[PDB]
Amino acid sequence: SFEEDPEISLADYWKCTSCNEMNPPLPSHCNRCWALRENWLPEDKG
């Protein structure tokens, strides 16, 4: 199922490393197990 989403395409989604679920960029944790993403915010070590 795909709908009009030019502002937020499903391609921008992410893959929860816990269960391997797909989620949008809006949230951070998987919408099932709540596997709060790890690599989201701008990670700039140094």
Long-range own/partner contacts, residues 37-46 (CB < 8 A, 24 or more apart): 40/14
Task: Give min distance, CB of 10 to Zn ion, in A.
Answer: 17
Least distance in Å: CB of 22 to Zn ion? 9
Contact with Zn ion (CB under 5 A): which of 18, 25, 28, 37? 18
Tell me how far apart the alpha carbons of residues 19 and 23 are, in angstroms, rounded to a whole number. 12
Assigned token pair, 41: 């915010």
Q: List residues near Zn ion by CB under 5 A.
A: 16, 18-19, 21, 30, 32-33, 35
Residues in binding site: 16, 19, 30, 33
